[PDB]
Amino acid sequence: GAAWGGSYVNDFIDRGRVKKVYVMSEAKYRMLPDDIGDWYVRAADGQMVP
Amino acid sequence: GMAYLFVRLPSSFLPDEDQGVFMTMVQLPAGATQERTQKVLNEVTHYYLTKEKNNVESVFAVNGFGFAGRGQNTGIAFVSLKDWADRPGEENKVEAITMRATRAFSQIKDAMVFAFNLPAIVELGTATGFDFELIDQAGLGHEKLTQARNQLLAEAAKHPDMLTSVRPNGLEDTPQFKIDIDQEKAQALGVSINDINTTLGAAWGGSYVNDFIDRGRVKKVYVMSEAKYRMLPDDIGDWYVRAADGQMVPFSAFSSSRWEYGSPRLERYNGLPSMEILGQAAPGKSTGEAMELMEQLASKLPTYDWTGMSYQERLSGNQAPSLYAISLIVVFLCLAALYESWSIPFSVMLVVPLGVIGALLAATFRGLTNDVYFQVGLLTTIGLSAKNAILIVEFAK
Amino acid sequence: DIAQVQVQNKLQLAMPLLPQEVQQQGVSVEKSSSSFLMVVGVINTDGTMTQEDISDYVAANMKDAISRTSGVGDVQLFGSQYAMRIWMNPNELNKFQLTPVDVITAIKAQNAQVAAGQLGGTPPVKGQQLNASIIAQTRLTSTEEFGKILLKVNQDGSRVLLRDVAKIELGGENYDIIAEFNGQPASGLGIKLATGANALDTAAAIRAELAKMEPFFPSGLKIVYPYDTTPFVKISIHEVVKTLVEAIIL
Amino acid sequence: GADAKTVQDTVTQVIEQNMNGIDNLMYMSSNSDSTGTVQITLTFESGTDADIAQVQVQNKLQLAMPLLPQEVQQQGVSVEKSSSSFLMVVGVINTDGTMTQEDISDYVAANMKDAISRTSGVGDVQLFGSQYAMRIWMNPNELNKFQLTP
Amino acid sequence: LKVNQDGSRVLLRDVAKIELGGENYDIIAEFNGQPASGLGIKLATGANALDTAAAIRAELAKMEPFFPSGLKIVYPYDTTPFVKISIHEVVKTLVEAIILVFLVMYLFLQNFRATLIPTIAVPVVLLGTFAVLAAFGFSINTLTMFGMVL
Amino acid sequence: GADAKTVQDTVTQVIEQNMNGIDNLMYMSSNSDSTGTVQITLTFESGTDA
Amino acid sequence: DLGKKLLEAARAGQDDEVRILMANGADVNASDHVGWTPLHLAAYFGHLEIVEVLLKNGADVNADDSLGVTPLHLAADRGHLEVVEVLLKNGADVNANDHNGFTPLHLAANIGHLEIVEVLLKHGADVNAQDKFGKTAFDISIDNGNEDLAEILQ
Amino acid sequence: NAVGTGVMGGMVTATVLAIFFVPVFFVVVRRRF
């Protein structure tokens, strides 16, 4: 849900005023259903899993 | 003789009075310690209780405070005086104590100490001064805006016949001790970032962890390093942070430092940054005068320049006497109906200067001002001599 | 005024039952009407800046001042104030054995403004002469500053930084809205009139506060009035005054 | 412990951002000094009612509160109304030289303050000191000895 | 904090000096060379300032016997007399006013009866004034009494 | 989770000593529950604005 | 005394009242209080005229201050070309070290100022400057972001 | 004083002068009209 969706992590100083900081994923990699088996997440044993 | 004497009489809101108290300032150089600013205050209070122990009752010496700004380099002292029955002659009135007490505090070296009677009414809206605000309209920054002020504050002195006592309210920039730490070394030593930004701002800054109860009252529990462990920059190489290899690393193995310039008291106004300036009008001149030049001089300021005038200055915009006109329109309409004439009203209305001229002679003998007790003091002699007249007119008529 | 005081009072209880990430966004209580009083638009005659740039000036340099102007219930932005956007790539995160959770972690710890105390600070010791502040760790400013951000240290000696997995672009807070004036890239503010406030006086007020801040726009930054319901009130009202005088002469 | 940038950028800027939709505001002063304190005077049109003025301001501060640091939120953002109109001050001094101002203040606070506040015919009352506080002064040398960090 | 593998224990006293302390140490006030905390007392709405000063005056005397050794209070800034004197002076001027109107009236006139009529008409009107101020909200203050001796 | 007293000294005495000025205040009462809760009630001069 | 008057004028930029203070015999080693004498300040804001005036009258160009920062450092970081050249003409140390290990060549790399780096290199350059962190000139040029800055350092 | 000098002094004038100048004011205004 950070990858799609997104996540407002922080605050930072952009040219004086204070502004926000998001995190999400590039569109290409989030446009198709076959793209879920494209993403891998870490496991304690150290291996990514589709 | 009335019109001539009226404008040659300085005008003012209200005379200071002798309230039995007067206040004094004490400013010290940037970097001054709390201890140094206290040895000065020691001197001030002795003077009042020695070289003039027939007129002073007690001295309340507050180290570490100031109306311009706070910090270990400031202090205010307030003086309380004896009954007027124990003081006689105008040689012992607050003005006489004050000028004579400010004129003894000059030999002092390294301090800017100066006693002064306090404004009647506690109105920071001290009279005949203006209140200038210089804003940052674009995303310029501090070093940038701080420059543009020194610049307006240059001209301001180029017109001593117009403007005097013009100064910045706030505080000048001072040196800082900036300190950065490198992540690469940091992750490579096992040490976590959260472990650092906290063992610093806690030991050095003070951290308030929780609450505790004492004597039936809740209070705060704070944590900090011992006075003698957070004084100077060397002392920074004494703290160690535990790594994850279960090893300890000294603070001086992931960090660097130097000196930078920053500002205490950063001011701001209506959202964007500001420097406040206050001054007053030169002797003889007015304030409608002493503010127009400030407004222009300012317009030449390098673009993101804006003027916000506030407070004493702001209300001044108000008001034009559209009342002095109404007021006078009515006094006429009234006589018009009493005597039943558009013309006779004038014979009663003429007496105004006869009442006012004696007001002005009376004043100038002594040295008094165009304050509010005067302006009503006229209004009552105007009203009464116009009354006499209505009678002689109506008896004659 | 009081109707707002209560509805706020009852909200302030519900606050801590809402997800961490709905509080950080800030919930707003307003007392406006539901119809736009006026839409004050903003174009760029020079085209020096894009429809994204345009929206971020409006957002960061005009909206608060108008939202604090007495009589203004609500200000709705047609576009989004910038925000440091970061776009992560799946193939590159797996390549290095990483997960997006980790990415979030490195940002919270390198982009932080922390309080560090000061030297010679109270309580002083016996015989202190020096007294300064201490500074470290200020917020990040440029995307570039963010690109540096260290993610991990390979045993190999490789530097996995934030750039290598994401494309950092200062970017909009959100991409939902795109305004266009006359088929031309634009932005603006939908202003709603707080309850009971005089429309005309309120309008005079924006106009006044909007004027205070024209003398500082960048190249070709023009203001436009695509939607304003106010002029019809002023003209209407003077049209009756006219038929008054008129009827007297007749 | 904060500098004035930390204070201004964060606590001060954010508050300023969210003080929206208040009524009858002429102007807004603010100054973020280095002693750690911010100070945001809001000046209202004359004849405004102070009680309402202050509550709308307090309301937007509240919604703005989840946005400020942890350690400012813990501390407290008070909102008083400014006058500088003291009917007097009372000097609580100590001729015996047996107690510090630290003590005098605690004493005034716990005993005199309630009575002063409840005093017939008196309005608000300031205290020119604090209450005692628990202070743990560490030694940087000790902790390391034990592979301990603050 | 930690337990020695050696098994000895590390307690907080061992690495910090735990003593009660004030929240803040920034400012230090004094009075004739001795420490004092003071208190700022604001005059509550719609209140009388001569009373409220006598009130606290008694209320301070009333807690006197519980004070610690050497603790005694004083008045570094009191505005009351300035309000007490002012009022004495209003009434004085109005007193010697009538006296003068008696003699500047007996002298020109002959009879005793004429002098008297003034002594009645004057204090009547001057009394009514207070009533109507009261209606508009006005207080008895420095401005509104001089506004009467005039 | 707290006794009635712990509260009084951390909650009720906090609030009550802060209540120094109020237009038209007659009296003021305050009970602490031990259910960990509490309430304080201020009664105003009768002709008063609620 | 006047020394402080001078310090308060080197900092501000009032060069006029620096001639007057030079006229009456002020101090040029007034240093305060962190050890930053006026030459240090003049460079850091920065003012050419007063750097020079001061230089003529009596100025340690190389003044360490508490941390060893020297005017040359201050110039490079704040990054004033015109003032880096002058401090170099009147004799400075381009291999000057902070208690840190920061020479004027790292501080110029960090700021991304390719125009100062070149001069510094011409005057002096240890491109093998080992930082407290062993990072060097071309090392901090990559990590930083700049590309062409690493070119010159290959 | 401020209410004492601009009144006592102001008065000595508005009576010495007025008792002579107002028999005038009334005669010169019945003239022009």
Short mmCIF file of C-alpha atoms in Angstrom, two decimals, chain D residues 35 75 85-102 104-105 107-108 111-113 115-116 119-140 142-143 146-148, chain E residues 1-2 4 10 14-29 31 34-44 47 49 52-53 55-56 59-60 63 66-80:
data_model
loop_
_atom_site.label_atom_id
_atom_site.label_comp_id
_atom_site.label_asym_id
_atom_site.label_seq_id
_atom_site.Cartn_x
_atom_site.Cartn_y
_atom_site.Cartn_z
CA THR D 35 16.00 30.34 24.74
CA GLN D 75 5.64 20.44 26.95
CA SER D 85 -1.92 45.73 33.73
CA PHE D 86 -0.75 44.63 37.17
CA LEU D 87 -2.51 46.16 40.20
CA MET D 88 0.72 45.45 42.05
CA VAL D 89 3.48 42.96 42.56
CA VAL D 90 4.24 41.32 45.89
CA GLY D 91 7.86 40.82 46.84
CA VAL D 92 8.38 37.52 48.62
CA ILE D 93 11.96 37.87 49.87
CA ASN D 94 14.11 36.17 52.53
CA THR D 95 16.13 38.23 55.03
CA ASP D 96 17.30 35.18 57.01
CA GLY D 97 19.22 34.06 53.92
CA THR D 98 18.11 30.51 54.68
CA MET D 99 16.30 29.83 51.39
CA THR D 100 16.82 30.27 47.62
CA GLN D 101 14.53 31.80 45.08
CA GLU D 102 14.02 28.26 43.97
CA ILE D 104 10.66 30.92 47.63
CA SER D 105 8.96 30.27 44.39
CA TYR D 107 6.47 28.16 48.45
CA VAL D 108 4.68 31.03 46.91
CA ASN D 111 0.57 28.24 49.25
CA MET D 112 0.28 31.84 48.27
CA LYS D 113 -0.85 31.25 44.70
CA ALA D 115 -5.13 32.12 47.97
CA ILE D 116 -3.95 34.86 45.61
CA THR D 119 -8.34 36.20 46.56
CA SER D 120 -11.43 38.31 46.60
CA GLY D 121 -11.40 40.77 43.83
CA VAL D 122 -8.36 39.54 41.96
CA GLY D 123 -8.12 38.38 38.38
CA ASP D 124 -5.29 36.47 36.78
CA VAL D 125 -2.06 35.98 38.69
CA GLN D 126 1.41 35.33 37.30
CA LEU D 127 4.18 33.52 39.17
CA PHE D 128 7.74 34.83 39.00
CA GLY D 129 9.36 31.42 39.35
CA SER D 130 8.74 27.69 38.94
CA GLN D 131 7.89 24.73 41.15
CA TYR D 132 10.59 22.33 42.10
CA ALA D 133 11.45 19.78 39.49
CA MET D 134 13.28 16.49 39.57
CA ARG D 135 16.71 16.89 38.15
CA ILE D 136 19.07 14.02 37.34
CA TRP D 137 22.43 15.32 36.40
CA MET D 138 24.42 12.68 34.67
CA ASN D 139 28.15 12.05 34.34
CA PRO D 140 29.33 11.29 30.87
CA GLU D 142 30.04 7.06 34.34
CA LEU D 143 27.77 5.79 31.64
CA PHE D 146 29.14 0.59 31.78
CA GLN D 147 28.63 0.72 28.10
CA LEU D 148 25.61 2.81 28.81
CA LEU E 1 19.69 0.53 34.37
CA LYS E 2 21.88 -2.52 33.95
CA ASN E 4 26.42 -6.54 36.25
CA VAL E 10 23.95 -0.35 38.36
CA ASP E 14 25.50 5.85 40.59
CA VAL E 15 25.79 7.74 37.29
CA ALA E 16 23.78 10.91 37.96
CA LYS E 17 23.42 13.28 40.91
CA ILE E 18 19.74 13.16 41.84
CA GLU E 19 18.64 16.34 43.63
CA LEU E 20 15.45 18.39 43.33
CA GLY E 21 15.75 21.25 40.84
CA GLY E 22 13.76 24.02 39.19
CA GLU E 23 12.36 23.60 35.72
CA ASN E 24 14.29 26.59 34.42
CA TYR E 25 17.45 28.35 35.45
CA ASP E 26 17.49 31.21 32.92
CA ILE E 27 16.49 34.16 35.09
CA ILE E 28 17.49 35.23 38.54
CA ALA E 29 15.75 37.99 40.45
CA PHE E 31 15.69 42.51 46.05
CA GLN E 34 18.40 38.96 48.75
CA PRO E 35 16.45 36.40 46.67
CA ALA E 36 12.71 36.96 45.98
CA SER E 37 10.09 35.40 43.69
CA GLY E 38 7.37 38.04 43.63
CA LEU E 39 3.85 37.75 42.13
CA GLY E 40 2.02 39.85 39.52
CA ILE E 41 -1.56 40.55 40.51
CA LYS E 42 -3.99 41.69 37.84
CA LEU E 43 -7.20 43.48 38.83
CA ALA E 44 -10.20 41.32 37.88
CA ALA E 47 -13.58 45.37 40.39
CA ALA E 49 -8.87 48.65 43.22
CA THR E 52 -8.84 44.52 46.23
CA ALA E 53 -5.63 46.03 47.64
CA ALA E 55 -8.22 42.57 50.62
CA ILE E 56 -4.93 40.98 49.65
CA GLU E 59 -5.01 38.11 53.24
CA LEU E 60 -1.21 38.42 53.29
CA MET E 63 -0.99 33.91 56.36
CA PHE E 66 2.77 30.28 58.81
CA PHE E 67 5.72 31.83 56.92
CA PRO E 68 9.11 30.12 57.33
CA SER E 69 11.96 31.77 59.25
CA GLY E 70 12.95 35.12 57.77
CA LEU E 71 10.34 35.12 55.02
CA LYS E 72 8.68 38.55 54.90
CA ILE E 73 6.77 40.31 52.13
CA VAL E 74 6.93 43.82 50.67
CA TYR E 75 5.36 46.07 48.01
CA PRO E 76 7.85 46.92 45.21
CA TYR E 77 5.10 48.34 43.01
CA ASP E 78 1.72 49.44 44.28
CA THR E 79 -0.49 51.81 42.41
CA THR E 80 -3.13 52.25 45.00
#
